[model samples]
Target: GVQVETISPGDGRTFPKRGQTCVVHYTGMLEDGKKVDSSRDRNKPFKFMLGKQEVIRGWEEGVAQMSVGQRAKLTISPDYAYGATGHPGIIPPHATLVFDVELLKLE
Candidate 1:
């Protein structure tokens, strides 16, 4: 096993440590376990880097701790999300975020 140092990740889009492009299929849920978004539903996969701040802060941090083919259920705080200025329609202001992440690869 490799020893990895991890930071508490926020729900930012870009990674803080490195740039690793990846493809993923995810399901977004609320704290009450309601599905908010999903790749399977959209019939598409997502791609981005880890620790590069290119994705949600929570996503950047969570995926940094993952291996290829790993799945994670993340509970994100509002501070890690859009914060007081959350994205309209889908994300509410001051809302935290949750994600069911599946790491397919790090390119």
Candidate 2:
């Protein structure tokens, strides 16, 4: 399961649904704080269809729990992430990932 700690609760009460698209800015880091990726650094937001498996399982589950303009820290277990076979060269095996995520919009 994913652990979602809200950093900034967004304005609205609305949450994204399964078929909607979620737009977010994120920085992914390892347990030791090694950055793996960041949409913020790229000056771009990442977008994916909710429940569509376009991203990691944790992201699908975690992002769905967010509202527009929300900021959160999502601690994702390997089971909800890349599991035993992590992304080679980027993520190590069984790595636990930490993501600083901001929900920008839902469409």
Candidate 3:
């Protein structure tokens, strides 16, 4: 399961629904605070369809709880992330990850 901490709340009450497209910016890091990836570095927001498994389980679950303009920190355990076999080169096996995520838009 994903543990969520709200950094900032959204302006509206709207939330992304299943099948809707979501756009977000995120920075991912290991438990020790080593950054691994960031949408900001790419200068582009990441887009995905909700409930489609296009992203990790933690993202799917965590992002769904967000409203447009919301910013949050998600602490994802291995089971909700890459699991026992983490992403090679980027994430080590059974690694826990933290993400600073902002829901930019929904379409």
The model with the greatest TM-score is: 3
Q: List model 1 lDDT by residue over 3-101, tens digit each.
A: 222223333343323766877788887767888789978877888876556766777666676666666677788777677888888888877667777
Please provide, for model 2 over 1-107, each residue's C-alpha lDDT reduced to its tens digit, 9 standing for 90 to 100: 89999999887587999999888999999989999999989867988998777988999888888889999999999999999999889999999999999999888
Worst 10 residues of 2 by lDDT: 43-52
Kindly list the per-residue Cα lDDT of model 3 for residues 1-107, writing each as its tens digit: 89999999987589999999999999999999999999999968999999888999999999989999999999999999889999889999999999999999999
Worst 10 residues of 1 by lDDT: 1-10
**What is the Cα-based lDDT of residue 41 in candidate 2?**
90
The Cα error of candidate 3 at residue 37, in Å, is 0.3
Clash number for model 1? 21
lDDT of 2 at 44: 75
Q: For candidate 1, give the lDDT of residue 107.
A: 72
Candidate 2 vs. true structure, TM-score: 0.95
RMSD of 1: 7.5
